[PDB]
Amino acid sequence: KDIEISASESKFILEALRQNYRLDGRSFDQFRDVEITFGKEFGDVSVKMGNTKVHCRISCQIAQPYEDRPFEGLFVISTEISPMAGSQFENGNITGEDEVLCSRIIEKSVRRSGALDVEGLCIVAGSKCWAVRADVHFLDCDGGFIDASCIAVMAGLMHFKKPDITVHGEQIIVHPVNEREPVPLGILHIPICVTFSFFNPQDTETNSEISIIDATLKEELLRDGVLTVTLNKNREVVQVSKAGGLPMDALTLMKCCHEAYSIIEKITDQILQLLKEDSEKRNKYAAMLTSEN
Amino acid sequence: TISILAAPSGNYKQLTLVGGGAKITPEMIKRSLLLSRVRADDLSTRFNI
Amino acid sequence: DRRRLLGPAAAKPMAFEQELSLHTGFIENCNGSALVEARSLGHQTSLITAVYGPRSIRGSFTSQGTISIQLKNGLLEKYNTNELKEVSSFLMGIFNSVVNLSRYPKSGIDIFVYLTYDKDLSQISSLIPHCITSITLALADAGIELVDMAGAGEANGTVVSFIKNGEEIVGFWKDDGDDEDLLECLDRCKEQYNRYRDLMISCLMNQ
Amino acid sequence: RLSLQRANVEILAVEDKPATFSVSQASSDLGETFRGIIRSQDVRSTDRDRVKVIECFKPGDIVRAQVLSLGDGTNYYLTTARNDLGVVFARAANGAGGLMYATDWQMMTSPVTGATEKRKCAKP
Amino acid sequence: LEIYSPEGLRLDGRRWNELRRFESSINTHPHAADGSSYMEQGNNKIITLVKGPKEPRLKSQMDTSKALLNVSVNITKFSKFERSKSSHKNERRVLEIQTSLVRMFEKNVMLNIYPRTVIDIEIHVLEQDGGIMGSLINGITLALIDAGISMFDYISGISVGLYDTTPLLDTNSLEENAMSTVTLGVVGKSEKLSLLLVEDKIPLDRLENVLAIGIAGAHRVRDLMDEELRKHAQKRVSN
Amino acid sequence: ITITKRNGAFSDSQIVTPGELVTDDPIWMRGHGTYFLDNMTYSSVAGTVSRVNRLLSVIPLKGRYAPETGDHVVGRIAEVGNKRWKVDIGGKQHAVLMLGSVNLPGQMRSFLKEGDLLNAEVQSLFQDGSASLHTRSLKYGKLRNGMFCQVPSSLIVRAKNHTHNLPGNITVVLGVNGYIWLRKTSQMDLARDTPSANSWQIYSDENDPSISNNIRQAICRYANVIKALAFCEIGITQQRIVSAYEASMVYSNVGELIEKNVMESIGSDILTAEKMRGN
Amino acid sequence: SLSVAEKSYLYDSLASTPSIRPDGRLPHQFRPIEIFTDFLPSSNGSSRIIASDGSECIVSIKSKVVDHHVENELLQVDVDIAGQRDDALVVETITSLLNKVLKSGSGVDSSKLQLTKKYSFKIFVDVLVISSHSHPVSLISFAIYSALNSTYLPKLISAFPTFHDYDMVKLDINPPLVFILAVVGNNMLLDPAANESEVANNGLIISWSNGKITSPIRSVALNDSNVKSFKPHLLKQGLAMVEKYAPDVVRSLEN
Amino acid sequence: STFIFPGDSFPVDPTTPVKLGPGIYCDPNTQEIRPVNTGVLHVSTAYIDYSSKRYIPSVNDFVIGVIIGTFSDSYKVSLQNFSSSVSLSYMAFPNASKKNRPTLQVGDLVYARVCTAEKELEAEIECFDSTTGRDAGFGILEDGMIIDVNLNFARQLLFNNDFPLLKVLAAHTKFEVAIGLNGKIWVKCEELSNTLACYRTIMECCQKNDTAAFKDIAKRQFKEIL
Amino acid sequence: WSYVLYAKIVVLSRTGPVFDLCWNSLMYALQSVKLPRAFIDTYEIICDQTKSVPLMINAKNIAFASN
Amino acid sequence: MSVQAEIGILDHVDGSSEFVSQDTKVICSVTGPIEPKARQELPTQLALEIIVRPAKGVATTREKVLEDKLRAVLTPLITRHCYPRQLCQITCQILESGEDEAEFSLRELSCCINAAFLALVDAGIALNSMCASIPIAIIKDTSDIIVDPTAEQLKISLSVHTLALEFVNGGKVVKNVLLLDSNGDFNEDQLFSLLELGEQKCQELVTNIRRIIQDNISPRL
Amino acid sequence: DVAIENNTLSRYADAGNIDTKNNILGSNVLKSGKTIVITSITGGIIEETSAEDIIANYASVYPVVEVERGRVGACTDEE
RNA sequence: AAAAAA
Numbered sequence A: 001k002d003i004e005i006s007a008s009e010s011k012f013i014l015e016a017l018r019q020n021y022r023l024d025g026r027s028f029d030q031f032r033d034v035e036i037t038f039g040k041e042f043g044d045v046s047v048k049m050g051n052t053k054v055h056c057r058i059s060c061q062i063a064q065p066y067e068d069r070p071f072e073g074l075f076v077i078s079t080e081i082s083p084m085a086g087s088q089f090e091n092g093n094i095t096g097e098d099e100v101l102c103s104r105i106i107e108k109s110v111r112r113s114g115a116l117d118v119e120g121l122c123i124v125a126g127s128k129c130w131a132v133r134a135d136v137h138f139l140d141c142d143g144g145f146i147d148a149s150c151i152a153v154m155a156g157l158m159h160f161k162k163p164d165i166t167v168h169g170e171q172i173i174v175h176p177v178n179e180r181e182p183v184p185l186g187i188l189h190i191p192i193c194v195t196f197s198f199f200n201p202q203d204t205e206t207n208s209e210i211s212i213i214d215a216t217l218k219e220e221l222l223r224d225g226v227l228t229v230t231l232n233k234n235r236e237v238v239q240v241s242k243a244g245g246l247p248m249d250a251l252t253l254m255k256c257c258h259e260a261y262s263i264i265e266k267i268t269d270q271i272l273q274l275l276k277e278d279s280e281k282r283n284k285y286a287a288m289l290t291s292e293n
Numbered sequence B: 001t002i003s004i005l006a007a008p009s010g011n012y013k014q015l016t017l018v019g020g021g022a023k024i025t026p027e028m029i030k031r032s033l034l035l036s037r038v039r040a041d042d043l044s045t046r047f048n049i
Numbered sequence C: 001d002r003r004r005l006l007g008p009a010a011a012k013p014m015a016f017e018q019e020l021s022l023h024t025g026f027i028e029n030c031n032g033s034a035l036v037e038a039r040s041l042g043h044q045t046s047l048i049t050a051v052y053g054p055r056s057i058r059g060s061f062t063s064q065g066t067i068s069i070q071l072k073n074g075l076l077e078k079y080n081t082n083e084l085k086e087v088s089s090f091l092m093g094i095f096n097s098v099v100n101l102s103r104y105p106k107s108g109i110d111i112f113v114y115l116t117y118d119k120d121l122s123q124i125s126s127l128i129p130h131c132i133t134s135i136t137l138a139l140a141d142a143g144i145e146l147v148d149m150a151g152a153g154e155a156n157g158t159v160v161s162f163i164k165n166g167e168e169i170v171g172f173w174k175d176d177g178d179d180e181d182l183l184e185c186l187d188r189c190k191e192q193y194n195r196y197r198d199l200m201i202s203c204l205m206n207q
Numbered sequence D: 001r002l003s004l005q006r007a008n009v010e011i012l013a014v015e016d017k018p019a020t021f022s023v024s025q026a027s028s029d030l031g032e033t034f035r036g037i038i039r040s041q042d043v044r045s046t047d048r049d050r051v052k053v054i055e056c057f058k059p060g061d062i063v064r065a066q067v068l069s070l071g072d073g074t075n076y077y078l079t080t081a082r083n084d085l086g087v088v089f090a091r092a093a094n095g096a097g098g099l100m101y102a103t104d105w106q107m108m109t110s111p112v113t114g115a116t117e118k119r120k121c122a123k124p
Numbered sequence E: 001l002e003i004y005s006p007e008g009l010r011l012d013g014r015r016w017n018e019l020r021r022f023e024s025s026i027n028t029h030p031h032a033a034d035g036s037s038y039m040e041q042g043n044n045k046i047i048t049l050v051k052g053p054k055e056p057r058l059k060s061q062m063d064t065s066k067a068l069l070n071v072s073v074n075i076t077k078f079s080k081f082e083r084s085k086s087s088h089k090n091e092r093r094v095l096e097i098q099t100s101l102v103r104m105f106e107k108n109v110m111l112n113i114y115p116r117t118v119i120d121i122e123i124h125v126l127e128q129d130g131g132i133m134g135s136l137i138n139g140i141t142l143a144l145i146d147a148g149i150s151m152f153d154y155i156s157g158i159s160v161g162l163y164d165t166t167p168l169l170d171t172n173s174l175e176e177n178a179m180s181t182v183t184l185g186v187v188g189k190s191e192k193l194s195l196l197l198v199e200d201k202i203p204l205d206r207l208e209n210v211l212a213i214g215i216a217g218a219h220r221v222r223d224l225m226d227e228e229l230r231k232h233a234q235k236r237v238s239n
Numbered sequence F: 001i002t003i004t005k006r007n008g009a010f011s012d013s014q015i016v017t018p019g020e021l022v023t024d025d026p027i028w029m030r031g032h033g034t035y036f037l038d039n040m041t042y043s044s045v046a047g048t049v050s051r052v053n054r055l056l057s058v059i060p061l062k063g064r065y066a067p068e069t070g071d072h073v074v075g076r077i078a079e080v081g082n083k084r085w086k087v088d089i090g091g092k093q094h095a096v097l098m099l100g101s102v103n104l105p106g107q108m109r110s111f112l113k114e115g116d117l118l119n120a121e122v123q124s125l126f127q128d129g130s131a132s133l134h135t136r137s138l139k140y141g142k143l144r145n146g147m148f149c150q151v152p153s154s155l156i157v158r159a160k161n162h163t164h165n166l167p168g169n170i171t172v173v174l175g176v177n178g179y180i181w182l183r184k185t186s187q188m189d190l191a192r193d194t195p196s197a198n199s200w201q202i203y204s205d206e207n208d209p210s211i212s213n214n215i216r217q218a219i220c221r222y223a224n225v226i227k228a229l230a231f232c233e234i235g236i237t238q239q240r241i242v243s244a245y246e247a248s249m250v251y252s253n254v255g256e257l258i259e260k261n262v263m264e265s266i267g268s269d270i271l272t273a274e275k276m277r278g279n
Numbered sequence G: 001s002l003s004v005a006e007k008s009y010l011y012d013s014l015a016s017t018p019s020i021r022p023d024g025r026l027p028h029q030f031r032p033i034e035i036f037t038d039f040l041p042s043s044n045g046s047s048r049i050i051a052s053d054g055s056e057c058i059v060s061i062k063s064k065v066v067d068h069h070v071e072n073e074l075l076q077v078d079v080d081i082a083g084q085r086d087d088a089l090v091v092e093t094i095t096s097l098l099n100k101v102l103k104s105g106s107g108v109d110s111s112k113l114q115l116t117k118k119y120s121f122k123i124f125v126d127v128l129v130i131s132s133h134s135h136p137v138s139l140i141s142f143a144i145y146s147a148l149n150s151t152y153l154p155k156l157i158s159a160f161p162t163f164h165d166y167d168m169v170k171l172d173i174n175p176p177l178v179f180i181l182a183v184v185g186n187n188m189l190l191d192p193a194a195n196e197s198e199v200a201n202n203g204l205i206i207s208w209s210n211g212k213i214t215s216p217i218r219s220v221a222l223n224d225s226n227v228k229s230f231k232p233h234l235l236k237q238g239l240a241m242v243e244k245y246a247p248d249v250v251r252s253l254e255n
Numbered sequence H: 001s002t003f004i005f006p007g008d009s010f011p012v013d014p015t016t017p018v019k020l021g022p023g024i025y026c027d028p029n030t031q032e033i034r035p036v037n038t039g040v041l042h043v044s045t046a047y048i049d050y051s052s053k054r055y056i057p058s059v060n061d062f063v064i065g066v067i068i069g070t071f072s073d074s075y076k077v078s079l080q081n082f083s084s085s086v087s088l089s090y091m092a093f094p095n096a097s098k099k100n101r102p103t104l105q106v107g108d109l110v111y112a113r114v115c116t117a118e119k120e121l122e123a124e125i126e127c128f129d130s131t132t133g134r135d136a137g138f139g140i141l142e143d144g145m146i147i148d149v150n151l152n153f154a155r156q157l158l159f160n161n162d163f164p165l166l167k168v169l170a171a172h173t174k175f176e177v178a179i180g181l182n183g184k185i186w187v188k189c190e191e192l193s194n195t196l197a198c199y200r201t202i203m204e205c206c207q208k209n210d211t212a213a214f215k216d217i218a219k220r221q222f223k224e225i226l
Numbered sequence I: 001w002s003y004v005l006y007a008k009i010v011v012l013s014r015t016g017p018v019f020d021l022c023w024n025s026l027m028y029a030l031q032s033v034k035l036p037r038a039f040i041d042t043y044e045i046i047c048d049q050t051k052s053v054p055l056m057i058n059a060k061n062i063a064f065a066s067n
Numbered sequence J: 001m002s003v004q005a006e007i008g009i010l011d012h013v014d015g016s017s018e019f020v021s022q023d024t025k026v027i028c029s030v031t032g033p034i035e036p037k038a039r040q041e042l043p044t045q046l047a048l049e050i051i052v053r054p055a056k057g058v059a060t061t062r063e064k065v066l067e068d069k070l071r072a073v074l075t076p077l078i079t080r081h082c083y084p085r086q087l088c089q090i091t092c093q094i095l096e097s098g099e100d101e102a103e104f105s106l107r108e109l110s111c112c113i114n115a116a117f118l119a120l121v122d123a124g125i126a127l128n129s130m131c132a133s134i135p136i137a138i139i140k141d142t143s144d145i146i147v148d149p150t151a152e153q154l155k156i157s158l159s160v161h162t163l164a165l166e167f168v169n170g171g172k173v174v175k176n177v178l179l180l181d182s183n184g185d186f187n188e189d190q191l192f193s194l195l196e197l198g199e200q201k202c203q204e205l206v207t208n209i210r211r212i213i214q215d216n217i218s219p220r221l
Numbered sequence K: 001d002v003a004i005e006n007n008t009l010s011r012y013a014d015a016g017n018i019d020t021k022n023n024i025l026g027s028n029v030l031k032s033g034k035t036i037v038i039t040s041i042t043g044g045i046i047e048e049t050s051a052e053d054i055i056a057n058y059a060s061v062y063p064v065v066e067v068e069r070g071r072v073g074a075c076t077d078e079e
Numbered sequence L: 001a002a003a004a005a006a
């Protein structure tokens, strides 16, 4: 199934971008306001960008590490898209172009960037360790798959706390949540992805390019180029992925890194704040229940 | 359709009832559970296993 | 695995006078079926062969039929999947000469051979003549036209299939064993062929 | 399925020769069953030009026809021009209602709910 | 081990701006594909076969306007010194590379002049030792040219690693495991990048200086490919 | 058996490459291999610069067969649907053969089906470059009574007549597409161009009932020499074939012509002979 | 994919008593090939073979260390054909066939790979078929043969694990060969061409080791159409044909 | 108001003859009338108004479709995403011709009405009403911009003249507009800023769904672009 | 250590719902299961090729299927 | 048994709903009637594509059972003969288990039924009647019947149950039982005592559901 | 009617002669009418490292049902 | 796999 776009729409939106206007009434360097809501359980996190709605749930289990890396842990991400986001997406399709792209992008942002400590997830070297799984649920599709799934995963991992484990010989025991408090996973830095959409309009023909940030579903179908840069508050590039599309200068590439750094810094302080507000939310509730005993 | 897992002890295990073509009167459940008890009691002791 | 129930992946598996019985047409799910059971010395073999066809293929322009054979492991997981494909390729090289393909244009015949029980007190070489016996029975029971009755025998790991009363050969399988057994194996398997042939013909007439 | 200029079906059984029939066993949920197409001009000899296909056949209705030309190796070309050919067995509302019987050649009624639907009926 | 000596040398003895052994090959398999190329960059040995433009297999895949560009990268198990027991055929990292390479050449190759056709690119990596993504690009570029397929310009690949404050050009596997690398794809002699790829951590402070070496370094890669192509062209035009 | 074991390893013509500026003169007419961008002409492929009259273009070093109106080609039926036939002429696309472009005598699969070879003429061209085949002639029709062999499409130049009769009672059909058909010389082949100055069996699948061994080995030898000339990248003409067929008579057995040192011998023999008696 | 007019021509030509091949070859003639060796430094051994029709096969030889008491098979042959699946019918067939051709208790000496009483060298054979216009079983066979003739392993130091850091061992063994034959009418044919196999009545796969015919020996159907039964005298003739013309091909590929 | 639920008893007596309509279902066997949707029952005529974002082909309905394919017999036009295609004949245009065919490319917006719409047959539309002067705005819609809304907002806008949308927008700007019953609204102005102002209003009005909030939204939207 | 029971059920000549027949066959199969003893001289585990004990399941909970 | 539900939370879908019961939260979405695939086409009736995904991991055979049980409920509800040869995509995503997903899947099943029916209403599909599903369990010790239990109540439970009934005439008269699932040790007396309390509590949620629709649908009209 | 054959395919089929190759712990052949069912039980050993009639005390087996309809491919929704 | 002039 494919989305049918009229010729009138394609001419209207393109002309509007030349007049620095867009449908949702935003700027070119502006990112959609992101609200983050945590569920009852730890690790459960809902992220919403405009009309785009996603869901994430962090889990864990006791498993055995690879023979190649016995001193490390295990990490895996599920980005399978259900038709819930739209009939455009087929049921059970991992061979999707933009689908495997979003999976690898956020994988490179977590694993190869040293964001999550896999060495601290190792219980017994070469025997048993922790296996952290992150399942991304794509509820509504208005665009910005990469961006929204990047925040949901990161915010979830920092809000997730694994049960405390004590080693007794070769036997591995698990402490209940009521007896002991779960230990949070160690995160060295928080990577956040920013998606760019490029356009090359006609008429007013020598030099003309349009680049916007976090395009909607209608703007995503009309773009001639795709760019995703991942940055953190540590003044460093986590990862950047540009495959083909509209050929661009190296100056415009770093021009998009400067516009993105102001965006990722703003929402990372938002995540840490909403983590702080939720951490104290569970603290004041724990003291109130005890006082009525 | 009606799916029953009956035991020789008299109790039951799995009970699956889905009506999609006609109403399911309680008299037919009792008739089903009756027929399922004898069916399960017959299969319990048949080949002396 | 999200398809089946494989259970815990951190676990490990367990670590520790020729006689024939022929029955055909006992499966109502397909067009033709056959049951072959053979017991000899300390080695018995029981396998089931199902034949589905001939069924029309949409858009097919083939002027003849198309045979597909697949062997399966019913119970004991012994034979490698790679080896099962090899025998399957060998079996199809046989029945493409046996089956009158000119009768079924734009059609295809699928043949499923389930290897149920095989006790042993090469290796798969001994089962080959029984697979040929089963298929030839299942095809003849299904209504598929066969130019001749296909049968075979196993002698010192050397399997050779015969038709036209042993006068010609429709298949040859030589694995391990020894040398200079060319004339001997051809004579010993020819006796097994004639024996398997008459019992196959009798099987179709009686029931 | 029903289209505007034609009506495609699937072959189930074939009438023998001197009634007895030969049932073709196949899976209807796969598509391995032989498919056939009845042209709008092959519906009836009366007024071959203009024929309303909606008022002739219906999805699920059983149609007795005679094959003219095999054409290609995909679809068969049938016809219901004669009297003994047409919709034989059918139900009201695409099979939702009760059974209907053939009275007139161009009218099918149901002596149960009193419903009448326009079909192409054969001769008893 | 010592990756970068203070005297300005590496493990192989190359400088910070020295490329590895660069040898190209055109029309190596005229009996297999319409165009063929054998990229030998350092220890990397890649066979690239371009089949097309030709009629599609089934009518399911056909474009009435442009052509269909498909890329299959077959990473052999005997590439690296340590043989992988599992096939890389359906691995995520391969499905990414294949799709990326397509998007790269989709705009470079003139698909609009080859309508209702299919251009198939089969790639076999016999051996890989760092900068494999860049080498794959050089393999496709030459192979597409030999097949006589019209494209706008060259697309040259290069891998740039960063050790401390000193960048490196055309890195090997040992260096890729010891530092962060930046793979590039350059359209012609221009400063426009067709492909930008960064996996590991890289300081935002030093980025322009990294790309500038990569773009210029990829330009010498283009010249070496241009030299060999013209060298091969003048020999067969001699007759 | 022959082996080659090597260890350790695996008015001028301007050569241009993709991206290179061929000329700064916008006057010229843009042809193949060149794209227009701001009054400048750039090359899209790698090859020689072709300046003919007003038309400017670049000839690729290698490329598939380009169908032109009037080309005599040999093709194989790839698929048959509706009222058309789609024939493979080894081009970029499948050539089409309409039902009105063949000869109906007094179910299309009963005439031509998948696999059948034929020779035809390119009647016209589509906008996508596809060719429309036309078999309405006494010189065109379904092929039989011989064997097929394939040579590069750039080794057979256009000509007034592509069907030549050769000594040994055989006939060659040199297609511009590179697809060649050798067959026994028939009644039509014997007297074709001569009577000009002076029908249900045309789609038959069966060959001539009597094929002498003298013709089979001729068909065989004529095939080995053509692929030999192609091995040396020599343009195949009717004269090059006859010469090669006679030059290969120094080898008693026909099978000796399959060798690499033998093919290059026959090829070099014609190159030196035409150079010696040509000057 | 030949027309019936071509198939009927090639059959009548091959089935004739003075059998005329389309390329003029005698029933025992082989088509000219080209073999490259030792072109992969990362691997212990490598080979590449080009055929007349344009068929190409790359075989890589690598090795590791493991206990030979826990591993019965010290020789694993993997086949990957371009444009083909790993679970394909033809692929897994050849994969299973070559493993029987090259086995520790079939056509390969197990004492040759023996270093110590505890540990031994296990050889991994990888096969990459670039192009295939026919049955590559014979083509791959000649490639694996030349690949094992030119091989270099880490040289041992002690006796009965440590290796030599520079000097290497050259494995000298007698690798088996596989010759595919074509049965057309009453005549036997060696090295069947692409177009010959499509009209052949039947076919034979015969192995060869140490100047003698050995297992595996199969009777493969080169096509799916003109496949017919054959007289027993053809099997005796074919085997004898391989027997006498094998020292010729072995001698050629030895250089 | 009287709210209705599916399966509930029908208040209307079966004695007096009552014409059917959308929302209610006549059981082909038991011959009883039951509601199948959720909403307000309107009795003048008997039908049920229910919230739906998906359009279904029906006779005498004005729809805005997009050409997704051009055949030799007719046009393939999609009135909505993922829905089945509709058949737009070549003779369904004013001043039709035999050999000469109307000029429409793939992607062109067409404003037509549905002539014949069967449940078990491919629907058909015609670019000329049958008839209202042959010009109710029917034909190709050049340029402009379209917006996706629910079916409830579309029908009330086209039929009901008391709807304060065309009344409040006419004061803010001068424009021509076409509204389809499939949830499509096509609006074209002179300047692009006006079309953008109209798009943002309908987008917000459909979301909030308030009759008295039309003038408030339109005031702040047109003053936002300046 | 703990035992884990893997089961494989093949169905031939399917007519109607086979869950009822698959359950009954599995129940009869479970009624007669022998668990071979294990022993050991990271260490592996070795099962005896002869000695075994019958599986003890609750006969009071054993049920049967019908549709 | 206090629950919470919302209608039309998704934009690009024809109809959607978000059901909340205790801790288990299952959001659903419905698109239709739309163009069906060739393999799903039904000449007379309407095709149903049902997809159920868990809160953690990938959909397995467990969810295949959930889809099969959910299909049995939604099938007689929808009037299939109103949309001949068409498609209806029903996707149910579980946000939170609300129980032990490894041992019990009957809590999530009822929530998948409830959420789906609400989405069917929002999407505007022809329904023959109404429906409501509740999870039931029986503790081994107390031997009491608990309607809509919690997570800890299931762990010590002897038998788990699932009831889904079809309601007509103002959500009072019961036409027929749509779904009745039961797992665990129980007798015949406990069964008829289950429907006695179940039918009462089912109608309690029916009238509860009905008022939810009114509050959401009416402002749109 | 129901007729079965128990312990016919197991290694413990015969008391005296025990199969050294067969790994089947328990087996059953069943045929009710036309449909035939063949069940085979295998086993395995797993190291347990963690820390009354309830759900946690009772376990189950992992069945792999293969319904043969004569079509190749993956496991159907039935299985 | 329709098309252009009159």
Ligand SMILES: [Mg+2]
Residues within 6 Å of the ligand: G080, G081, G082, G083, G084, G085, G086
């Ligand atoms: Mg492969």
